[PDB]
C-alpha cells in the first residue's frame, strides 16, 4: 500500500478520459506533436531549408501549409533545441527545421504510448489485445516512411514534410525517382487498402440489408438493444444471398471479422517493406528484358516504356526547385520535352 | 405450366446455385463476351495505335509484355468517340490495329456490370431482404463508368480512357495528374478519406469484434470453431467491445448500437467513393483541382514558391513528356 | 518410457485449402514478372 | 525476350512447394473424419 500502488490506483480511475501509466508517455507526446504541427503551419516558414513559404502567416492556405523537413545540410541531426546546430536559440531552431524532428520524434513516442494504452485498457477490461495488434500496421508505416526512409538517404530533407500539398509532392517524387507504382510491395498495399474499404462497405451493407424485423418503426436502428443475446441480422440469409450472387460467401462470423482485421493490416505491412527498400534506392524501377528489347528495336513500345518517359520528365522538371541545395542548372536545351509542349 | 411461365420460373428461381434473374439474362452474355475477348486480346492481340499517330503500342503477352506491362490498349484517337464494332472494319486486321477490342470489352463490361447491380437488387427481393446492397455497389460501378466512359466522353476520345492493364492504369493516373491535378481536387481528397477511412474502420471493426469473442474453445483449436453457422446467439460481447473502445477514446465516440455501427461502416467508404467517381466525372469536363501556382508573392512581386509550385514542376514534367509525338500545337486542350 | 503426451493432430479444412492455394497462385502471378525481369 | 532463365524454376517452386504443403495437410485432414 505504498506510493506505487496508490499512484496506480489514481492513474486507472474510471474517468471521462482514461489516463493509465501509458498516459504519461502518450499525452505529452501526442499533444506536443499536434501542437508543433499547428504552431509550425500557422507561423513558421520554410524559406531557409527549402526556399518555400509554408505558414498561414506567410499567405498559405490549409492545403499548402506544412512543417517542412530540415535542410539537406543537417544530415540526420536530431536537431535538438539545445544541440550544436540551434545552440538553444528557439528562433533559429524554427528556421532550421527543428520543428520537423520535434514532431516526428514526439509523434513516434506518442504512437508507442497509444499502442501501450490499447494494451493497458484491454488488460483492465478483460478483452483480447487484437486492437493493439492491428495498430502495429500504422506504426510500421509511420516509422518506415518518416524515419527509416530518410535515414537511408542523405538526410531528413527527403522525408515527407508534414502538409497536404507537401505529401502530394512526396507521392509524385516517388513516382518519378523510384517508380513506386511498379513495386509489388506497394501493389500489395493497394490491394489491402482497397480491399479493406470494400470489406468495410460490403459488410456494413449486408448487415443493414439482412436485419431482422425487431421493431415496428421504419427507422430500424431503434430495434437493437446492446444487451440482447440474439443476432440482429440473419447470417443464413446473408450467406444465401452472397453464394447466389458471387458464388461464395462467408459462413463463419469469427472468420469474417478476423479477415477484416487481416486484410488492411497485412497490406500496410507489405507497403512498409517496400519503402524500406526504397530507403536504399532498392527500387523496382525497370524490367531488364524490356529495356534490352527497346534499346535494339525502336518500334517496340509498351505502357512500361511510356511511363518511364513520364518519370524522366518529372525528375528533370522538378529537381532544381525541389532539391535547391544541389544547385542544378538545367538550360532549356537539355529539358526533355515532346513535340510542341 | 405453359412454356413461358416455366421459363420465367427457372429464370427467377431461388433454387439455382447461381441466381440468374432478368438482369442476369443480359449480364451473362455480355460478361462472357467481354471476358472471352479480354483474355484473348491480353494474350495475343497485336500492337494498337492508341493515339492515332501510327505509333502502335504493344499490349499483349505474345508481343513482348509481361503481366505487369500488358494491357488491352484503348482505341485509336482517329476514331475519337465513333462507334467501332467489328462489322464496321474492312477486316479483323484493321479492327485490331485501331483498337476495336477495347470498345467491345468496355461496352459489354459496363452493360454486364450495370446488370450485376440490378441483379443484386433482384435477388434481395426474391429472398425477402432489404434492398440496398446494390446501392453500395453503385460506388465502384460509378467509378468504372467514370474512367471507361464519362472521362472519354468529356475529352472526346476512348483513347484517353483507362487502359485495361496494370501499367496502363498507372499511365492513366499520371497523365490525369498532369492535365487535371486530381491531387489538389477535393473530390479526390474525399475519395482518399473514403478508402483510408474504409481500411481503418475495417481493421477497427475486425479487431474489436475479434477482441471480444466469447470463450467457446480451447487453446488447441481455432477460436473460429466457437461459432456455428446459423446459431441464434451473438458470438462476441458488444458491451465489452464498447467498454474497451469508449475508454480508448471517450465513452461517446464509441457505438453501443450494432445497427448504427454497421450503417456507418457502409456509408463512409461508399460516400467517399461516390465523390471520387464524381471527381473523375467532373474533371472529364475540365473543372480541375485548385491552382495555387504563384499565389504567394512578396512586397516587390517576386514569386515565393509553396509546395503547390513544387507540385506544378512535377506536373509540367508529366505534361511535356506524355504522348511525346502527338502534339503539334502549344496547348494540350484535350 | 511412455510415448510423448504432447502430440496433437493438425488440420486444414477445405476452405483453408482454397484460400491458401488462391494466395499462392495470385502471389506467383504477381511476382513471376519480376522473377523473369 | 531476354528474361532471367532461372525465373522459371523460381516461379515453379514458388507455386509448387507451398501448394503441396497445403494439399498434404488437407488430405490427411479428410481421412481422419
Amino acid at each position: 500500500r505504498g506510493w506505487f500502488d496508490i499512484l496506480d490506483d489514481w492513474l486507472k480511475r474510471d474517468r471521462f478520459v482514461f489516463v493509465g501509466w501509458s498516459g504519461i508517455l502518450l499525452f505529452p507526446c501526442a499533444y506536443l506533436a499536434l501542437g508543433g504541427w499547428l504552431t509550425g503551419t500557422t507561423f513558421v516558414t520554410s524559406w531557409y531549408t527549402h526556399g518555400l513559404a509554408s505558414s498561414y502567416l506567410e499567405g498559405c492556405n490549409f492545403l499548402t501549409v506544412a512543417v517542412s523537413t530540415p535542410a539537406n545540410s543537417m544530415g540526420h541531426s536530431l536537431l535538438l533545441l539545445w544541440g550544436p546546430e540551434a545552440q538553444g536559440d528557439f528562433t533559429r531552431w524554427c528556421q532550421l527545421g527543428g520543428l520537423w524532428t520535434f514532431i516526428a520524434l514526439h509523434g513516434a513516442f506518442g504512437l508507442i504510448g497509444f499502442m501501450l494504452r490499447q494494451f493497458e485498457i484491454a488488460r483492465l477490461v478483460g478483452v483480447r489485445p487484437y486492437n493493439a495488434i492491428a495498430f502495429s500496421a500504422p506504426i510500421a508505416v509511420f516509422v518506415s516512411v518518416f524515419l527509416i526512409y530518410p535515414l537511408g538517404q542523405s538526410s531528413w530533407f527527403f522525408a515527407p514534410s508534414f502538409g497536404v500539398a507537401a505529401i502530394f509532392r512526396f507521392l509524385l517524387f516517388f513516382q518519378g525517382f523510384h517508380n513506386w507504382t511498379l513495386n509489388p510491395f506497394h501493389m500489395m498495399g493497394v490491394a489491402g487498402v482497397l480491399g479493406g474499404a470494400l470489406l468495410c462497405a460490403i459488410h456494413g451493407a449486408t448487415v443493414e440489408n439482412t436485419l431482422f424485423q425487431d421493431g415496428e418503426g421504419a427507422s430500424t436502428f431503434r430495434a437493437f438493444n446492446p444487451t440482447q443475446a440474439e443476432e440482429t441480422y440473419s447470417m443464413v440469409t446473408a450467406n444465401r444471398f452472397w453464394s447466389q450472387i458471387f458464388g461464395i460467401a462467408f459462413s463463419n462470423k469469427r472468420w469474417l471479422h478476423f479477415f477484416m482485421l487481416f486484410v488492411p493490416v497485412t497490406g500496410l505491412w507489405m507497403s512498409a517493406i517496400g519503402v524500406v527498400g526504397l530507403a536504399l534506392n532498392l527500387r523496382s524501377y525497370d524490367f531488364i528484358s524490356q529495356e534490352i528489347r527497346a534499346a535494339e528495336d525502336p518500334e517496340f513500345e509498351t505502357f512500361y516504356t511510356k511511363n518511364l518517359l513520364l518519370n524522366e520528365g518529372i525528375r528533370a522538371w522538378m529537381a532544381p526547385q525541389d532539391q535547391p541545395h544541389e544547385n542544378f542548372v538545367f538550360p532549356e536545351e537539355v529539358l526533355p520535352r515532346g513535340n510542341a509542349l | 405450366a405453359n412454356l413461358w411461365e416455366r421459363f420465367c420460373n427457372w429464370v427467377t428461381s431461388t433454387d439455382n446455385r447461381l441466381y440468374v434473374g432478368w438482369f442476369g439474362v443480359i449480364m451473362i452474355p455480355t460478361l462472357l463476351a467481354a471476358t472471352i475477348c479480354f483474355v484473348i486480346a491480353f494474350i495475343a492481340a497485336p500492337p494498337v495505335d492508341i493515339d492515332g499517330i501510327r505509333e502502335p503500342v504493344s499490349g499483349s503477352l505474345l508481343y513482348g509484355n509481361n503481366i505487369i506491362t500488358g494491357a488491352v490498349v484503348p482505341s485509336s484517337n482517329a476514331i475519337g468517340l465513333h462507334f467501332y464494332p467489328i462489322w464496321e472494319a474492312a477486316s479483323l486486321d484493321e479492327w485490331l490495329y485501331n483498337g476495336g477490342p477495347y470498345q467491345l470489352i468496355i461496352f459489354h463490361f459496363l452493360l454486364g456490370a450495370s446488370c450485376y447491380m440490378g441483379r443484386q437488387w433482384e435477388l434481395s427481393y426474391r429472398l425477402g431482404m432489404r434492398p440496398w446492397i446494390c446501392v453500395a455497389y453503385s460506388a465502384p460501378l460509378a467509378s468504372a463508368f467514370a474512367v471507361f466512359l464519362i472521362y472519354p466522353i468529356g475529352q472526346g476520345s476512348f483513347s484517353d480512357g483507362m487502359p485495361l492493364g496494370i501499367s496502363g492504369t498507372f499511365n492513366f493516373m499520371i497523365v490525369f495528374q498532369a492535365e487535371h491535378n486530381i491531387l489538389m481536387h477535393p473530390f479526390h481528397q474525399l475519395g482518399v478519406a473514403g478508402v483510408f477511412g474504409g481500411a481503418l474502420f475495417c481493421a477497427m471493426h475486425g479487431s474489436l469484434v475479434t477482441s471480444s469473442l466469447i470463450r467457446e474453445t480451447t487453446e488447441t483449436e481455432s477460436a473460429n470453431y466457437g461459432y456455428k453457422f446459423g446459431q441464434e446467439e451473438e458470438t462476441y460481447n458488444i458491451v465489452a467491445a464498447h467498454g474497451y473502445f469508449g475508454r480508448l477514446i471517450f465513452q461517446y465516440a464509441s457505438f453501443n448500437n450494432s445497427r448504427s455501427l454497421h450503417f456507418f461502416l457502409a456509408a463512409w467508404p461508399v460516400v467517399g467513393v461516390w465523390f471520387t467517381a464524381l471527381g473523375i466525372s467532373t474533371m472529364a469536363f475540365n473543372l480541375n483541382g485548385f491552382n495555387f501556382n504563384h499565389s504567394v508573392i512578396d512586397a516587390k512581386g517576386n514569386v515565393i514558391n509553396t509546395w503547390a509550385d513544387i507540385i506544378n514542376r512535377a506536373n509540367l514534367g508529366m505534361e511535356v513528356m506524355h504522348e511525346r509525338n502527338a502534339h503539334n500545337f502549344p496547348l494540350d486542350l484535350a | 518410457m511412455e510415448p510423448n503426451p504432447n502430440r496433437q493432430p493438425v488440420e486444414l479444412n477445405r476452405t483453408s485449402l482454397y484460400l491458401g492455394l488462391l494466395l499462392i497462385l495470385v502471389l506467383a502471378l504477381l511476382f513471376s514478372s519480376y522473377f523473369f525481369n | 525476350m531476354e528474361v532471367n532463365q532461372l525465373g522459371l524454376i523460381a516461379t515453379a517452386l514458388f507455386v509448387l512447394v507451398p501448394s503441396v504443403f497445403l494439399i498434404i495437410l488437407y488430405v490427411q485432414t479428410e481421412s481422419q473424419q
Binding site: - | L18, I67 | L25 | -
Partner: peptide, 30 residues
C-alpha cells in the same frame, strides 16, 4: 516460356474458382 507460365497460373486460378464454388464445403445450419 514466360508467356506459357503466366497463362498457366491464370488458368489454374480459374480452375480453382470452379472448385471453390461448385465443390465448396456446404454451409450447414447449426
Amino acid at each position: 516460356m514466360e508467356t506459357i507460365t503466366y497463362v498457366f497460373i491464370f488458368a489454374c486460378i480459374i480452375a480453382l474458382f470452379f472448385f471453390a464454388i461448385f465443390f465448396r464445403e456446404p454451409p450447414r445450419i447449426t
